[PDB]
Amino acid sequence: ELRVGLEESELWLRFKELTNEMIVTKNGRRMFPVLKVNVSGLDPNAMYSFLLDFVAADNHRWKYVNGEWVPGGKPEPQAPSCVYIHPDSPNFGAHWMKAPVSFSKVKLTNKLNGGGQIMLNSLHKYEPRIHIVRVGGPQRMITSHCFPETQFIAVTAYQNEEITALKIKYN
Ligand SMILES: CC(C)N1CCN(C(=O)c2cccs2)CC1
Structure with missing residues (x-):
């Protein structure tokens, strides 16, 4: 059975319990923490590409009001994000299963851009x-x-300073 697991979930859960934020820029900003995935149960000899996308978790605009994140009232459909190809792709099952698959080079933007960068709202x-x-x-x-x-x-800048502090503490 193909098993997919999150590396360093302990650290992600610190960010999640404060509401995590990721900076987006016109040129694109790399993520911290980086998504690292533990993969077992591939055919070591079969060929695979690893793809990353971002699902809009809800249809709302959020705003940091009086130190708390709160959803707008006016949902809109969110078109799915473009897909980012892990640069080691395509590769053998063995390659992917020998160490955590790290999406360290994906860049998040707020502007339609040449290529590589993934545009988020x-x-x-x-x-x-x-x-x-x-x-x-x-x-x-x-x-x-x-x-x-x-x-x-x-976010185009951090709202919750607790996130700003965690980002620096663990980078
Ligand atoms: C020209 C360049 C953009 N290539 C497109 C295909 N690609 C993959 O690894 C994929 C295979 C199957 C689905 S994606 C990366 C290399």
């Missing part, structure tokens, strides 16, 4: 998601996994 809440795509073989297959622990609101 500022003040929307996001749930990171990966797709493991078996490629090259005859039988294409996809396995998807969500990481609730890694939820965040996309």
Whole structure:
């Protein structure tokens, strides 16, 4: 059985219990913490690409009001985010299972941009998601996994100083 697990969930849960925020810039900002995934149960000899996208967790705009995050009243449909290909893709099952798959080079932006960067809506809440795509073989297959622990609101600057402090303490 293909098992997908979150590396350093202890640290993510510190961020989650304060409401995590991720900076987005015109040029794109790398994530901290970085999404690292533990993968077992692949065919060491089969070929796979690892894909990362961000699901809008709800249809609302959020705002930091009197030291607390609160959803707007006026939901709108949120089109799904573009997908980021892990730069080691495509690769053998063995490659992916020998160490945590680290999405350290993904950059989050608020502007439609050349390429690489993933555009998110500022003040929307996001749930990171990966797709493991078996490629090259005859039988294409996809396995998807969500990481609730890694939820965040996309912000152009930190609102909760407790988050600012955690980001620095653990970088
Ligand atoms: C030209 C460049 C953008 N390539 C597109 C395909 N790609 C993959 O690893 C994928 C395979 C199956 C689904 S995605 C990365 C390399």
